[PDB]
Design a protein around this ligand. Structure first.
Ligand SMILES: CCCCCCCCCCCCCCCCCC(=O)OC[C@H](COP(=O)([O-])OCC(O)COP(=O)([O-])OC[C@@H](COC(=O)CCCCCCCCCCCCCCCCC)OC(=O)CCCCCCCCCCCCCCCCC)OC(=O)CCCCCCCCCCCCCCCCC
Ligand SMILES: CCCCCCCCCCCCCCCCCC(=O)OC[C@H](COP(=O)([O-])OCC(O)COP(=O)([O-])OC[C@@H](COC(=O)CCCCCCCCCCCCCCCCC)OC(=O)CCCCCCCCCCCCCCCCC)OC(=O)CCCCCCCCCCCCCCCCC
Ligand SMILES: CCCCCCCCCCCCCCCCCC(=O)OC[C@H](COP(=O)([O-])OCC(O)COP(=O)([O-])OC[C@@H](COC(=O)CCCCCCCCCCCCCCCCC)OC(=O)CCCCCCCCCCCCCCCCC)OC(=O)CCCCCCCCCCCCCCCCC
Ligand SMILES: CCCCCCCCCCCCCCCCC[C@@H](O)O[C@H](CO[C@H](O)CCCCCCCCCCCCCCC)COP(=O)(O)OCC[N+](C)(C)C
Ligand SMILES: CCCCCCCCCCCCCCCCC[C@@H](O)O[C@H](CO[C@H](O)CCCCCCCCCCCCCCC)COP(=O)(O)OCC[N+](C)(C)C
Ligand SMILES: CCCCCCCCCCCCCCCCC[C@@H](O)O[C@H](CO[C@H](O)CCCCCCCCCCCCCCC)COP(=O)(O)OCC[N+](C)(C)C
Ligand SMILES: Nc1ncnc2c1ncn2[C@@H]1O[C@H](COP(=O)(O)OP(=O)(O)O)[C@@H](O)[C@H]1O
Lengths: 104, 459, 320, 56, 347, 122, 98, 49
């Protein structure tokens, strides 16, 4: 037969604009196509994007940034009023730390 | 956190019980709803994580990754329905099932409290990806790619398993919280060196590290568009997440065990950025771009500073979004002309102006233009590296130039010049592709508006 | 209950049902001879089940509804285009020959199953032992390649050795010129193109290979053109045959058990027809195979098992 | 007429029902980790005259 | 063969295995082995042909030699301690000979050469029986005498079995030989953990038996003995090929499939003793078995191979004989990992 | 090695000693039992698929029997597993109590007097 | 051990080496198998008689019985091999490879 | 429609269906009774109530 096997020919690609000039690129059926576009646009831009950004922008401060600022203001006021240094090089009281007896 | 896990397991039978022409609509709608649900995990604390149960927890490092995964699933669904139109209903449902199973495994991986459970899920992610690549890839190289994708992973991960169980026979627990609190220094012995290597090599090969990256071009080129999206944007970040997690038990060995990997990362970042300059394949260029960015992330994780961790987290998020957008942009042209050569279809700005705008924005974000989160991550990593050693500003600086070049190179090759005369099958851009581009690009700048959401726990 | 080892352990034996009229009969002959009419008359007179000659759509007639399917989903070959273009470059000739051999094997399995299950005799037109002559006629005329003959010989060697040859072989002799006269007077416009060399090759193959080798197993009843219309005399000649020389008398209960398990379960019968030898004439690409299989599965009574297709009126599915 | 509508679009409640079921299972998991409720040194508190538990 | 005679022979095989499993006397265990061999020899030659006769002869020679070494080891043990009970095997030379004989019976390397030949020479049902049921008795004896084993010899044979199984299975296009080499590697895995924990051995044996039963039933359902004949099944029944691919993935040991559970557990057990290098080498070597399972999956399920025309006829008929235990076997082979702790019921 | 085969007082082929009756039985809503039922349902679906029957709706009695059998066996399997783990913990605690010299309780030391080396990250 | 015990062990080892090293005939290997069985019988009888283990005196007889089975089995197989090749040569059993 | 007998007819095999449902219901009620008695025995042995 001078051939190697029985096979279908490779078909040409289908253009969705031929049977649907306004085809949205979702499906060959115009109605399912239009509703796929509508649901994508409504649930992607309207619901998730804008409302999610609004929700994230107004998330309550669980990182305690404002609380930390107020605490720092209190401590700075107190230590400046009573003349103590603003910070200490030791974050732990040496009275509760027991160094080894002998260093030699 | 079962309020997120269960709806995906419900996406499974909803897809398998859907009418033959309504699978895509239902899947996309409910995946978008699941992403909206997962948006609530961004409300993190400043001290500890969200310990939902004995099995699952959420942290400031894993919540952006979970949001990115749940947001990426619908994008894959939209990007896949074009080239799968002629498929049968059962095979379409199988493809959607693979995607859903991959999302479920990734969601459980990013929140596991246990290192063996993390290993099991982080290894289970291979089967759907391998099936997708080797079944729905287009050319005959895909089979080889699958093999390259498989064993490269497994040869790195099987030693890790051994190390993991060894640790559990020494400390008695592999729970991450107990591991963090009961941490002890690693001595300098050969056994500790090999334990370090076993704990590190799996995540270093999943990054991938330079020299161990040969699987990535194959896997990201022969895969379908959804496969490339998930491989580049999420599956590469498993290595980064795992290294950030596992490095808590490797100090102070890392202090000197990072030198070969730091050297490889920097020089191979330069090397892959240079490789991008001479690439006839447009998908391979994006793959090597991913390699360079992940080399930067490797450096950031290896130098072990708070600024480096912040920059690394931001860079992973930004790279995921950007690389997914670039792959989709390349796939549009591929679907139009059925070829991956970059110099085949030229001057496309004349024919597709809005697509050219999308290309310009994607390329501008790829080269880390301020104040994009790509730049924020890159600059934080560069500052941390400068603190590590002043000479690094040379190599990093070199990369900053080369990236820009190849980035604009791609644009100038594909959008400018004159159109090819014999190519006359370039139809106007569909609404689906424009929506895909917009849903990729708008979150990037929206996160630029509020950058502390992707800066990780060290913020 | 379905026949198996359990039915053999308690009760069922094939040897008891054989009542001197088992007598597998085949009525061979060249193209356009009156072998079919003689077969029907023999079956009527002896009270045996008559099997019409297996065609392209024989397997369709026994599964689902007996109506034939499309040629694209069944056979994928044409006798008419074999007559029009016997040297076509799409491999139609050997594809047709292979499909016809598979159909004949299936028909022989069905006939053996009926005989061994009910004890009633059967009368076939041609058999798997006779199909090869057509293949030979295709080879001498250059219609098929030698590789096709090798593949046919391999398949026949692995398949036809598992069954028992017919008890009595009836052959009808019609000279080639008379066959051509009958063909001309018939009227089918595709058989006018049968050259005399093809029929001469068929008759040569018959008389030189089939009859000599078949006579060693059992005696052969040969009849000229004129002495075949008298079916009563032919039947009375068949009846007084001394059949004690072939493999049939040497068959005991366990061999009949093996053969009866073989004849049912048609998949095991057709097992070796699709051996992975890649001839261009019979090999089909993956894309075409997938498309044709998807087309086949969409037929009204083919998606599920016989009793589970609600689109052809199957009820009570959810309790079956 | 709602028979066809239901048999066509009943797959749209699987995911919301899974969401509610997941919330309920999260609450069930929460109820099994109350061994230190109102017992931490940082949040130990006296009960109000009416309330029974500090959190659920 | 008569169905009654066949049933009697099969029951005699199982009776020999049970006699080995329930005895406390070395003579009775030896008698069980003899009876099992005697009843097994005709079962391998149910379908008579020269290849079946060659397989039966090779199997008989190997098993008779192994049984003679077994009896000699028993007699030496009796000589150095007048005991017949199966116990700590008071003599070391007798224990070396016992280990060698049981390894020869199981097909452990380097006494592995007979397994691929015998598997290839017999039918699929006989190969199923040989590769699943015939492993119980020697492994039961090995479990009973596990405290007196020499770990060096046993571990050497196990490592050799894994290596040789992978390397030999790398080169096969015949499905029966692939199954035999997989069996050799899995016996290596089973015997590597035997000196440390017999419960892990039993768990590995159970999971291997389930997976092998599923594989062999799927191979009988789709009448394929070569790779190319298996490549045709997608055009006749794709569900079978999909289940076969998932079963192959489970046999390859990938998470989250249940075939991952045995090796995992064994690794953990071998890490409770020091034994770090050996499990790492063992997993590295099991990657080879995974490789040729993946090659089979490529050939049969993930790509479509060309078909033949006569396959259209096969579209019109259904499978007549129906295996009742196939779905349960497949489900147990795949979706069993989450029930891992239930292994406590084994000890 | 075998830990529990030679344990004194063990009946050869019992599968459930009387002492196991002293433990709380698994709840019928146990997630492990639900997973066993899911396994039975999957087995029924695969049975439907292999026989070329409508996968979800073909045989409801067969599927229900599949689920019932899997749940029925899984209940006793879970009971035996829980009994075995209770036995393990019982023996562990008894052995620890009977060998005080091998499990000493040393003095607790607070972090304020333990010298831990500091490794700067720079 | 006395010298007779070691002589019987040497006989067993010689028979084992004879089986393991095939020349051409399967019958010679079968004879080596029977020689192994005979040596095992003799040694078991000597050990049982030396220690006056009365109830073990039946053990050698049982041994012989199963030896017969093996012998019969082997001979049966030999017949079939001969019927395939007209010779009992072991080089004819090479249809199956590794 | 089918040219052959199709031994599985329009009506299902009522004996097999009835046996299947009967076995399933018997197993379920046996399981419930066993669970009840196990709960009662456990409470009695530990003396909760
Ligand atoms: C079409 C798009 C195409 C695609 C593109 C991509 C788009 C993607 C979108 C995705 C979704 C986005 C969602 C993000 C959510 C973000 C919302 C949010 O967080 O709100 C924050 C913020 C609200 O702050 P807040 O924390 O909620 O309020 C806290 C206080 O309690 C409040 O203080 P108060 O007590 O004083 O009350 C103030 C109140 C009332 O105050 C007043 O009324 C007084 C105002 C002053 C006027 C006074 C004189 C004028 C009248 C005089 C004459 C009349 C009176 C006398 C009558 C006689 C006449 C003489 O006004 C407000 O509350 C602010 C307006 C609220 C806007 C919220 C934005 C929601 C966006 C979500 C939808 C996104 C889509 C866009 C659709 C939106 C519509 C198009 O909103 C703002 O944007 C504020 C910006 C205004 C500040 C001035 C700008 C300063 C510029 C300096 C920089 C210069 C450098 C150059 C840069 C120039 C750039 C401008
Ligand atoms: C500072 C400016 C303030 C502006 C206020 C209003 C801003 C509106 C922003 C809207 C959201 C971004 C949309 C991007 C996708 C494009 C959408 C589209 O298809 O439009 C077609 C639409 C219809 O045109 P057409 O006839 O279809 O033309 C199609 C042909 O292909 C012909 O196309 P074409 O040739 O017209 O190409 C489009 C056009 C424009 O298209 C684009 O390039 C859009 C993307 C820009 C590059 C983004 C990557 C760099 C990272 C920036 C991150 C900023 C995020 C801020 C938050 C944004 C939240 C969404 O190309 C350019 O103009 C050059 C692009 C490169 C600009 C480089 C700027 C460097 C940084 C400047 C400062 C940024 C930070 C501000 C704060 C600094 C401290 C105060 O045209 C427009 O709607 C206008 C185009 C948008 C121009 C905005 C550029 C400046 C705005 C910068 C970011 C927004 C800042 C707002 C807060 C104030 C700061
Ligand atoms: C982890 C979390 C939990 C997940 C658990 C794991 C996943 C799920 C469990 C897996 C087992 C379950 C199902 C197994 C039996 C299915 C066998 C089958 O053939 O399916 C076809 C069958 C369609 O056949 P049909 O309807 O009779 O008519 C169409 C024709 O038959 C036309 O059919 P055809 O035969 O002509 O089509 C030919 C096709 C036929 O070949 C197949 O259908 C492939 C099926 C492979 C069987 C899986 C092996 C055993 C399970 C192991 C899974 C491993 C998972 C671990 C992760 C690794 C990923 C592999 O072959 C191909 O096209 C070759 C393509 C090669 C693709 C390579 C991938 C294959 C393996 C992937 C397995 C992935 C998991 C299962 C996905 C779901 C499958 C339905 O699918 C179904 O309709 C059944 C699926 C839905 C049933 C459940 C519905 C539930 C009821 C709704 C209410 C929900 C209750 C919620 C409670 C709350 C109250 C509201
Ligand atoms: C088409 C042509 C377009 C051009 C024309 C456009 C017309 C104008 C529209 C452009 C707007 C210009 C931007 C100007 C900035 C104003 C908005 C800003 O003020 O809001 C920020 C708020 O921004 C939000 O925080 C960021 C949005 C969150 C982004 C989430 C994306 C949605 C999720 C989708 C999936 C994500 C995938 C990626 C994984 C991470 C303020 O941050 P913050 O300092 O706090 O607010 C303090 C006061 N609060 C706290 C009381 C509210
Ligand atoms: C293709 C890319 C793949 C990824 C590459 C991964 C990189 C892995 C490299 C491993 C990093 C270091 C390994 C060992 C740490 C030190 C290395 C050694 O050179 O340092 C000296 C070691 O001294 C000598 O070098 C002895 C080692 C010599 C033998 C090692 C073989 C090196 C050959 C290189 C082959 C390439 C390996 C990669 C193969 C793919 C230090 O002296 P010493 O104090 O005594 O040892 C410290 C340990 N102590 C404290 C317990 C004693
Ligand atoms: C891949 C999945 C593997 C599943 C394996 C088969 C599962 C179905 C088989 C059903 C078993 C029926 C047996 C019940 C009848 C009672 C018999 C009882 O008396 O046997 C006891 C034994 O009970 C059995 O061991 C329990 C069988 C349970 C096996 C299932 C565990 C598999 C691992 C976990 C995977 C999840 C399995 C899911 C199940 C569907 C006797 O114990 P003992 O005589 O003293 O031990 C002898 C051996 N020793 C001394 C050397 C230790
Ligand atoms: N094996 C075969 N190969 C090719 N053609 C065949 C074969 N068998 C039958 N035919 C064709 O079938 C047609 C009718 O068959 P035949 O039995 O000879 O005539 P009739 O039906 O009148 O008895 C003839 O044209 C014959 O050529």
């Amino acid at each position: 037969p001078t051939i190697r096997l029985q096979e279908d020919p490779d078909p040409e690609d289908e253009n969705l604009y031929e049977k649907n000039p306004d085809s949205h690129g979702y499906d060959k059926d115009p109605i399912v196509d239009l509703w796929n576009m509508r649901v994508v646009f409504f649930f992607g831009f309207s619901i998730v994007l804008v409302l999610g950004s609004t929700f994230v922008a107004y998330l309550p401060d669980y990182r305690m940034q404002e609380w930390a600022r107020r605490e720092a203001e209190r401590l700075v006021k107190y230590r400046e009023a009573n003349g103590l240094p603003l910070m200490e090089s030791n974050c732990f009281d040496p009275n509760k730390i027991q160094l080894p007896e002998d260093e030699d | 956190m079962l309020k997120i896990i269960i709806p995906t397991t419900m996406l499974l039978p909803m897809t398998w019980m859907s009418k033959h022409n309504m699978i895509w609509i239902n899947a996309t709608v409910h995946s978008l709803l699941i992403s909206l649900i997962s948006l609530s995990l961004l409300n993190q604390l400043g001290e500890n994580s969200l310990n939902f149960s004995l099995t699952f927890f959420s942290d400031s490092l894993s919540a952006p990754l979970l949001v990115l995964t749940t947001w990426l699933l619908p994008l894959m669904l939209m990007a896949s329905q074009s080239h799968l139109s002629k498929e049968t209903t059962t095979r379409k449902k199988l493809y959607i099932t693979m995607l859903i199973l991959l999302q479920l495994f990734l969601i459980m991986t990013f929140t596991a409290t246990e290192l063996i459970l993390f290993y099991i899920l982080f290894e289970a992610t291979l089967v759907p990806t391998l099936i997708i690549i080797t079944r729905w890839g287009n050319q005959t190289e895909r089979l080889n790619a699958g093999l390259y994708f498989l064993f490269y992973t497994l040869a790195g991960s099987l030693p890790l398993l051994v190390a993991l169980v060894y640790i559990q026979n020494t400390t008695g627990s592999l729970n991450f919280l107990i591991i963090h609190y009961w941490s002890h220094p690693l001595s300098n012995s050969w056994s500790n060196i090999f334990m370090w290597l076993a704990c590190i090599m799996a995540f270093m090969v999943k990054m991938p590290l330079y020299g161990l990256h040969l699987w990535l071009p194959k896997a990201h080129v022969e895969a379908p568009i959804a496969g490339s999206m998930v491989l580049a944007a999420v599956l590469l970040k498993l290595g980064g997440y795992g290294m950030m997690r596992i490095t808590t038990i490797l100090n102070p060995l890392t202090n000197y065990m990072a030198y070969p990997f730091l050297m490889l990362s920097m020089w191979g970042m330069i090397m892959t950025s240079s490789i991008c300059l001479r690439q006839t394949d447009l998908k391979s260029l994006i793959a090597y771009s991913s390699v360079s960015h992940m080399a930067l992330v490797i450096v950031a994780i290896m130098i072990q500073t708070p600024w480096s961790f912040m920059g690394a987290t931001a860079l992973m998020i930004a790279h995921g979004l950007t690389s997914s957008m670039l792959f989709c942009l390349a796939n549009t042209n591929y679907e139009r002309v059925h070829s991956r050569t970059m110099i085949l279809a030229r001057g496309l700005q004349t024919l597709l102006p809005l697509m050219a705008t999308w290309w310009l924005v994607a390329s501008l974000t790829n080269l880390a233009l301020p104040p994009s989160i790509n730049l924020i991550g890159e600059l934080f990593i560069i500052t941390a590296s400068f603190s590590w050693s002043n000479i690094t500003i040379i190599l990093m600086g070199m990369n900053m130039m080369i990236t820009a070049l190849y980035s604009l190179y791609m644009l100038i090759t594909t959008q400018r010049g004159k159109y090819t005369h014999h190519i006359n099958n370039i139809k106007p851009s569909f609404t689906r592709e424009n929506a895909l581009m917009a849903l990729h690009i708008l979150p990037l700048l929206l996160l630029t508006l509020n950058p502390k959401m992707i800066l990780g726990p060290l913020y | 209950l379905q026949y198996g080892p359990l039915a053999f352990v308690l009760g069922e034996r094939t040897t008891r049902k054989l009542t001197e009229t088992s007598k597998v009969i085949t009525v061979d002959g060249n193209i356009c001879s009156g072998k079919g009419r003689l077969a029907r008359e023999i079956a009527e007179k002896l009270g045996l089940r008559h099997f019409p000659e297996a065609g392209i759509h024989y397997a369709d007639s026994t599964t689902g509804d007996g109506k034939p399917l499309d040629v694209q989903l069944s056979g994928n070959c044409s006798l008419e285009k074999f007559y029009d273009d016997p040297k076509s470059n799409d491999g139609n000739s050997y594809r047709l020959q292979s499909w016809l051999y598979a159909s004949r094997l299936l028909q022989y399995a069905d006939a053996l199953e009926h005989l061994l299950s009910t004890g009633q005799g059967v009368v076939l037109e041609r058999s798997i032992y006779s199909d090869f002559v057509f293949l030979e006629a295709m080879y001498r005329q250059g219609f098929i390649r030698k590789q096709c003959v090798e593949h046919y010989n391999e398949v026949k060697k692995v398949t036809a050795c598992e069954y028992l040859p017919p008890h009595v072989v009836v052959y009808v002799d019609v000279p080639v010129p008379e066959i051509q006269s009958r063909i001309q007077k018939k009227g089918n416009p595709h058989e006018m193109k049968i050259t005399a060399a093809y029929l001469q090759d068929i008759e040569n193959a018959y008389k030189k290979t089939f009859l000599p080798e078949m006579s060693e197993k059992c005696e052969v009843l040969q009849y000229s053109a004129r002495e075949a219309e008298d079916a009563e005399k032919v039947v009375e000649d068949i009846e007084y045959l001394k059949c004690d020389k072939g493999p049939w008398p040497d068959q005991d209960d366990r061999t009949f058990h093996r053969l009866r398990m073989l004849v049912q379960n048609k998949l095991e019968v057709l097992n070796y027809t699709t051996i992975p030898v890649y001839l261009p004439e019979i090999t089909i690409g993956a894309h075409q195979s997938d498309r044709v299989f998807q087309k086949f599965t969409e037929l009204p009574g083919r998606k599920y098992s016989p009793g589970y297709n609600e689109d052809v009126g199957d009820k009570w599915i959810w309790l079956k | 007429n709602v028979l066809q509508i239901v048999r066509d679009h009943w797959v749209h409640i699987l995911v919301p029902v899974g969401f509610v079921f997941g919330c309920y299972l999260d609450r069930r998991s929460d109820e099994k980790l109350t061994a230190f409720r109102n017992k931490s040194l940082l949040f130990k508190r006296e009960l109000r005259p009416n309330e029974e538990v500090t959190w659920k | 063969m008569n169905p009654i005679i066949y049933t009697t022979l099969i029951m005699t095989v199982m009776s020999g295995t049970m006699l080995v499993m329930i005895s406390s006397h070395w003579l009775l265990i030896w008698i069980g082995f003899e009876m099992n061999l005697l009843a097994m020899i005709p079962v391998l030659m149910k379908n008579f042909n020269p290849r079946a006769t060659e397989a039966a002869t090779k199997y008989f020679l190997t098993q008779a030699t192994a049984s003679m070494m077994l009896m000699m080891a028993i007699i030496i043990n009796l000589l150095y301690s007048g005991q017949w009970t199966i116990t700590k095997m008071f003599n070391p030379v007798a224990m070396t000979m016992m280990t060698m004989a049981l390894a020869m019976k199981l097909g452990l390397s380097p006494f592995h050469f007979w397994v691929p030949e015998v598997t290839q020479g017999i039918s699929l049902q006989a190969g199923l029986l040989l590769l699943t049921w015939q492993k119980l008795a020697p492994l039961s004896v090995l479990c009973q005498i596990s405290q007196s084993i020499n770990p060096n010899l046993m571990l050497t044979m196990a490592m050799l079995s894994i290596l040789i199984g992978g390397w030999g299975g790398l080169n096969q296009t015949q499905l029966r030989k692939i199954m035999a080499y997989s069996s050799i590697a899995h016996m290596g895995w089973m015997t590597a953990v035997l000196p440390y924990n017999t419960t892990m051995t039993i768990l590995n044996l159970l999971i291997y038996i389930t997976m092998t039963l599923a594989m062999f039933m799927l191979l009988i359902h789709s009448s394929a003995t070569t790779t190319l004949s298996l490549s045709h099944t997608w055009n006749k029944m794709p569900v079978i090929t999909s289940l076969m691919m998932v079963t192959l993935l489970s046999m390859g040991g990938l998470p989250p499939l249940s075939g991952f559970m045995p090796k995992w557990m064994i690794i953990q057990e071998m890490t409770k003793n020091e034994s770090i290098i050996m499990p790492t080498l063992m997993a590295m070597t099991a990657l080879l078995n995974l490789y040729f399972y993946m090659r089979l999956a490529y050939s049969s399920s993930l790509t479509m191979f060309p078909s033949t025309n006569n396959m259209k006829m096969k579209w019109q008929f259904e499978h007549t004989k129906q295996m009742k235990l196939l779905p349960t076997m497949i489900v147990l082979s795949t979706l069993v990992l989450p029930m891992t702790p239930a292994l406590s019921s084994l000890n | 090695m075998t830990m529990m085969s030679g344990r004194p007082g063990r009946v050869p082929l019992q599968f459930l000693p009387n002492e196991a009756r002293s433990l709380p039985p698994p709840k019928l809503t146990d997630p492990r039992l639900v997973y066993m039922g899911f396994l039975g349902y999957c087995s029924g679906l695969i049975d439907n698929a292999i026989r070329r029957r409508p996968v979800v709706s073909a045989g409801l009695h067969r599927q229900l029997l599949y689920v019932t059998s899997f749940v029925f066996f899984g209940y006793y399997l879970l009971k035996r597993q829980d009994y075995m783990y209770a036995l393990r913990d019982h023996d562990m605690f008894a052995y620890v109590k009977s060998h005080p010299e091998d499990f000493p309780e040393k003095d607790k030391k607070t972090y304020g007097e333990i010298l831990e080396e500091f490794h700067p990250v720079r | 051990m006395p010298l007779v015990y070691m002589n019987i062990i040497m006989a067993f080892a010689i028979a084992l080496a004879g089986l393991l090293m095939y020349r051409s005939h399967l019958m010679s290997s079968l004879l080596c198998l029977e020689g192994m069985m005979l040596s095992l019988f003799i040694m078991s009888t000597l050990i049982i008689l030396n220690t006056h283990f009365t109830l073990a005196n039946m053990m050698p007889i049982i041994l012989l019985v199963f030896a017969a089975c093996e012998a019969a089995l082997g001979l049966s197989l030999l017949v079939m091999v001969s019927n395939t090749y007209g010779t009992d040569y072991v080089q004819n059993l090479n249809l199956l490879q590794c | 429609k089918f040219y052959i007998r199709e031994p599985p007819h329009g009506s299902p095999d009522w004996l097999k269906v009835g046996l299947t449902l009967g076995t399933s219901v018997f197993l379920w009620i046996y399981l419930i009774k066993q669970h009840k008695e196990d709960v009662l025995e456990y409470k009695r042995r530990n003396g909760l109530e």
